[PDB]
Amino acid sequence: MINIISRLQEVFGHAIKAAYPDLENPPLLVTPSQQAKFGDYQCNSAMGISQMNPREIAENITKHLPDNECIEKVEIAFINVHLRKDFVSEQLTSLLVNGVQLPALGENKKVIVDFSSPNIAKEMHVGHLRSTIIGESISRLFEFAGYDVLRLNHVGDWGTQFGMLIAHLQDKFPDYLTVSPPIGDLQVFYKESKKRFDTEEEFKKRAYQCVVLLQGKNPDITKAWKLICDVSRQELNKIYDALDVSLIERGESFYQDRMNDIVKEFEDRGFVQVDDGRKIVFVPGCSIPLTIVKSDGGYTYDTSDLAAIKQRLFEEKADMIIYVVDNGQSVHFQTIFAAAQMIGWYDPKVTRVFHAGFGVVLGEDKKKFKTRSGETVRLMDLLGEGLKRSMDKLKEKERDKVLTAEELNAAQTSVAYGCIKYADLSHNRLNDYIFSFDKMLDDRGNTAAYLLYAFTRIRSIARLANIDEEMLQKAARETKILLDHEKEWKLGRCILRFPEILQKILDDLFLHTLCDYIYELATAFTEFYDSCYCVEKDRQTGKILKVNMWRMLLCEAVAAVMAKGFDILGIKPVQRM
Helix, strand or coil: CCCHHHHHHHHHHHHHHHHCCCCCCCCCCEEECCCCCCCCEEECHHHHHHHCCHHHHHHHHHHCCCCCCCEEEEECCCEEEEECHHHHHHHHHHHHHHCCCCCCCCCCCEEEEECCCCECCCCCCHHHHHHHHHHHHHHHHHHHCCCEEEEEECCECCCCHHHHHHHHHHHHCHHHHCCCCCCCCHHHHHHHHHHHHHHCCHHHHHHHHHHHHHHCCCCCCHHHHHHHHHHHHHHHHHHHHHCCCCCEECCHHHHHHHHHHHHHHHHHCCCCEEECCEEEECCCCCCCCEEEECCCCCECHHHHHHHHHHHHHHCCCCCEEEEEEEHHHHHHHHHHHHHHHHCCCCCCCCCEEEEEEECCEECCCCCECCCCCCCCCCHHHHHHHHHHHHHHHHHCCCCCCCCCHHHHHHHHHHHHHHHHHHHHHCCCCCCCEECCHHHHCCCCCCCHHHHHHHHHHHHHHHHCCCCCHHHHHHHHHHCCCCCCCHHHHHHHHHHCCHHHHHHHHHHHCCCHHHHHHHHHHHHHHHHHHHHCCCEEECCCCCCEEEECHHHHHHHHHHHHHHHHHHHHHCCCCCCCC
């Protein structure tokens, strides 16, 4: 598809060069209306050109507009732009013939997305769920735009929990050295180890011996750690499979041997002060220092986060690095980023390093999301409850109508996981998020449940008239898509904004504007469908008299874009109802 904003930039750029050839890189400021009053796009360059009058110049640009395919009409009110109908029509044909795609860039820049980040054998909460959903969808956006996307799970696989865990495994399964033991539920095993630590003397000493031996790579210490981490992987993979998430595991352990070099470099450059035996680093604009070495000579999360960002700048040679982490870690990551700058590992004008914040999760009462009480509610409990309530809806009354293959999973899971992903993403990530099954699962308004129904219905209009795929692909090649009726014209122009919308999110990482657009697209479809006959039937007999093929094609163009938006957001359709 064409990005109209980019196309308009070129069209107006030509006009400015022909009207003012001495200006060799003038600002080309194109934005969608802002309606309110008539106009599809606005060009705001006249004011830019003024300082480097406004009305005279606008009209001069206007009168030097080159021949083009997209502009019907222009007015000075700024320069309002109205698109041509034949342009939009042909663009609709093109996406049906060529498929939904963004315009390709000349390079495949490397983008790292860092998201999900569970700490091993500890509880995985709604904060992790957010990071997982937001991160996955950001990764899909960048992949759909032609970037080289590296999805990294920075898993907590090198923390002090492993002393306890390994000491427990030695007692519980002493032949782990020879045969892989049935560890079972990893969360249970942890609380057992934790209890023992809190209530015993020698176990506690042995847990500290185990951390020392794990750091120094004692085989039969590392072995224990691998087996625990393998159990963690199986469990997390159930979660990621269900949510359709792809991640390359790159834990804390990966950067362990690089941390000594980090401390050395910060010292050698004169950036380290000593306080009560702790090594600290002050960073520009920041009141709170990083702490890179503790009193006991141990490294911290500041040390490992510096190791990882340097690895990702130096070894991966990333053009962009995205950290999907809660608003609580904001100051920490700005501090990490400013330390990286200070020491000269990257330049923010050349390499994009970005923290994509998300707000705290609340209950319906507007207080923090907690169990009763007061432990953190698990993901498997949330996903389990969503699957339960999803079924309950289906139970009224989709009983013998649907196969249990196409019901007890397909429909159930689409709606449960789709509404969980969508309710989150449909709100601005930075804000406090209210987790509400009732609101997310509602069949009306802006919900995955509404949109899944809408998609199915849009797809059903051509098939229920006995038009098949071949007829539709044939129609697409030889049919002029008419846009005479106002609701055909609203819908056609709405469809063509998809690349614009995605282009903006590639800059600012606010996926809620994609959910806004998809909802607007669904709404514009329903206004089209309500006001324009797709099939025409006899009032009395209900006999099929005419099929309006171009209007079938409008349905299909909407399906195509919606399907793509769904994919980016992680919503899977199921059509069997």
